[PDB]
Amino acid sequence: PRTVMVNLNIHNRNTNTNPSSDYYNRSTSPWNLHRNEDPERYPSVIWEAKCRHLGCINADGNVDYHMNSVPIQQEILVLRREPPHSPNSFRLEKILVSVGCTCVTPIVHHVA
Amino acid sequence: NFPRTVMVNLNIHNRSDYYNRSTSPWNLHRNEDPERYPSVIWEAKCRHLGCINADGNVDYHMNSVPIQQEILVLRREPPHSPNSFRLEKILVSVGCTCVTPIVHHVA
Ligand SMILES: Cc1nonc1C(=O)N[C@H](c1nc(Cc2n[nH]c(=O)c3ccccc23)n[nH]1)C1CCCCC1
DSSP: OOEEEEEEEEEEOSTTSOOOOOHHHHBSSOEEEEEEEOTTEESSEEEEEEESOSSEEOTTSSEETTSEEEEEEEEEEEEEESSTTOSSEEEEEEEEEEEEEEEEOOOOOOOO | OOOSEEEEEEEEEEOOOHHHHBSSOEEEEEEEOTTEESSEEEEEEESOSSEEOTTSSEETTSEEEEEEEEEEEEEESSTTOSSEEEEEEEEEEEEEEEEOOOOOOOO
8 A cells, every 4th residue: 555554652672682782882983963853754863884094993992094993884765754744644655774883994996 | 732642644745785794793683573663673682792803803891782762652552453452662672883892890
């Protein structure tokens, strides 16, 4: 079906199975989260990661410029109000959200 | 307002190799549930307990850990309903990062 009903009273499911950890701070590719708010969307607030460094942190605690911190982006669906400002009708939309960062070897190639 | 039930049009409007190149590499596992939308959820599992060093060997002094994201999914309610759902909140691993471990003597 094109149109369906959704009950917005969320039930949690296994959110206390493999659940504070401070990975964003302990990572060799650390990041910070920034708040994105849009009143025309559910969820209205989405937190986005931004990597703190271009490089990665090494064993000595210094930045290793030979490796790159990169954000891990995830395709996410959101509900957008349709028509605009509607309290109770939406369309699904697809966006990319950065969830955190990892450290990768760069892709290397001579200029052509 | 904050209505209990809302209408959603499911015709979506749109708005990498890191898993192998990462020092905390991972593989993706596919979870399919016909009672859910999205029916398919892809989940990362870290390949190693440690992280990969400059030489390409595993360094056990660091840990590969999953980066978990809280996400909402639609679960059919009542079961098997083609057109009615409830939002549910789940935790999904979206990739891995390399962290310094938390160390403490046994008590
Ligand atoms: C967070 C967040 N910040 O804004 N919104 C959200 C959010 O939860 N949005 C949900 C969501 N998006 C998808 C995308 C996805 N698909 N497949 C995967 O393998 C996957 C694997 C990992 C993660 C996502 C997916 N799943 N759940 C929507 C919410 C409205 C109803 C429909 C679900």
